[PDB]
């Protein structure tokens, strides 16, 4: 039961972070991957990972902040990646919907990170929004030199999903699928994702599962809700939850090279 997408540096967790973490482990979660989205967040993510047991982090620059990418940024990321806690380069990718940085700025930062990851032999943690065609064109030639790649918070079409899977890319699924309103579309394709390419996450504090029975709705999501998300996904795939938990943990071990 590993959460590959915890935004643990969020201010929403400022007052009770020690509690959020202890409750996650007590609920059966055995590992958290803390997302870094720019240099300062990545440094904070690594410090949090070193502070708590069973935590690792990513180091990179999100397309939104790619405008901040400079040569000095590159050095700082390489240095951060050498730390034991940092196991993946990213969040990186492309976002042609928001365009908070120009496409030109985005491509430069994304390619520079693919390059860092290939050099260091580390997997990449990616984001893609309304940029699938260009995204795959830039990513495709780097895959044979990377240990792996995951596209987290995947909400795309089955055609995009099949293309990603055909290239050996892991697919991250959140509680988004527990929303009768927006997630039915993704829910329908869950049976199509190869078991060996599926990773689960909460994207906490966001995306609180709507079908959450306890009913603490319209609130902060947290990793302690991962088991509920996994039960649901297993149900929609026809699988046993304990079996799915073991299979996804194996995928995490395979992709990131960690013991948890």
Footprint of Zn ion (CB under 5 A): 5, 152-153, 201, 203
Nearer to Zn ion, 203 or 222 (CB): 203
Minimal distance in Å, beta carbon 248 to Zn ion? 14
Question: What is the rounded distance in angstroms from the CA atom of residue 62 to the CA atom of residue 64?
Answer: 5
* Residues 176/184, Cβ–Cβ less than 8 Å: no
Minimal distance in Å, beta carbon 79 to Zn ion? 25
Nearer to Zn ion, 46 or 58 (CB): 58
Nearer to Zn ion, 115 or 155 (CB): 155
Minimal distance in Å, beta carbon 5 to Zn ion? 3
Question: According to the annotation, is 127 in a ligand binding site?
Answer: yes
Nearer to Zn ion, 152 or 225 (CB): 152
Question: According to the annotation, is 152 in a ligand binding site?
Answer: yes
Minimal distance in Å, beta carbon 236 to Zn ion? 18
Question: What is the rounded distance in angstroms from the CA atom of residue 148 to the CA atom of residue 117?
Answer: 10
Residue 171's DSSP bridge partners are 151, 198
- Cβ neighbours for 55, distance < 8 A, ≥ 6 positions apart: 8, 21, 31, 32, 33, 34, 48, 49, 85
Planar angle of CA 232, 152, 117, nearest 5 degrees: 145
Cα dihedral angle (240, 243, 244, 249), rounded to 10 degrees?
A: 160
Nearer to Zn ion, 85 or 201 (CB): 201
* Residues 63/38, Cβ–Cβ less than 8 Å: no
Radius of gyration of the chain (CA): 17
Annotated binding site for a divalent metal cation: which residue ranges? 91, 127, 152
Binding residues: 91, 127, 152
């Amino acid at each position: 039961m590993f959460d590959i997408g915890v935004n643990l540096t969020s201010s929403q967790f400022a007052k009770d972070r020690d509690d959020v973490v202890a409750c996650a482990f007590d609920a059966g979660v055995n590992g958290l991957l803390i997302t870094g989205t720019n240099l300062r967040e990545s440094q904070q993510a690594q410090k949090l990972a070193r502070q708590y047991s069973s935590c690792w982090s990513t180091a990179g620059v999100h397309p939104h902040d790619s405008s901040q990418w400079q040569a000095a940024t590159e050095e700082a990321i390489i240095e951060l990646a050498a730390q034991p806690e940092v196991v993946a380069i990213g969040e990186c990718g492309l976002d042609f919907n928001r365009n908070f940085s120009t496409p030109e700025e985005q491509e430069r930062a994304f390619v520079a990170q693919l390059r860092i990851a290939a050099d260091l032999n580390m997997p990449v943690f990616m984001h893609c929004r309304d940029a699938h065609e260009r995204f795959m064109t830039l990513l495709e030639p780097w895959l044979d030199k990377l240990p792996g790649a995951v596209l987290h918070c995947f909400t795309g079409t089955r055609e995009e999903m099949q293309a990603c899977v055909a290239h050996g890319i892991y697919i991250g699924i959140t509680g988004w699928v527990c929303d009768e309103r927006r997630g039915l579309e993704l829910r329908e394709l869950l049976p199509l994702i190869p078991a060996e390419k599926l990773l689960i996450e909460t994207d906490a504090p966001y995306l609180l599962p709507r079908d959450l029975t306890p009913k603490p709705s319209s609130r902060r999501n947290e990793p302690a809700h991962l088991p509920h998300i996994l039960q649901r996904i297993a149900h929609w795939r026809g699988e046993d939850a304990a079996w799915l938990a073991a299979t996804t943990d194996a995928n995490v071990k395979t992709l990131f090279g960690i013991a948890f």
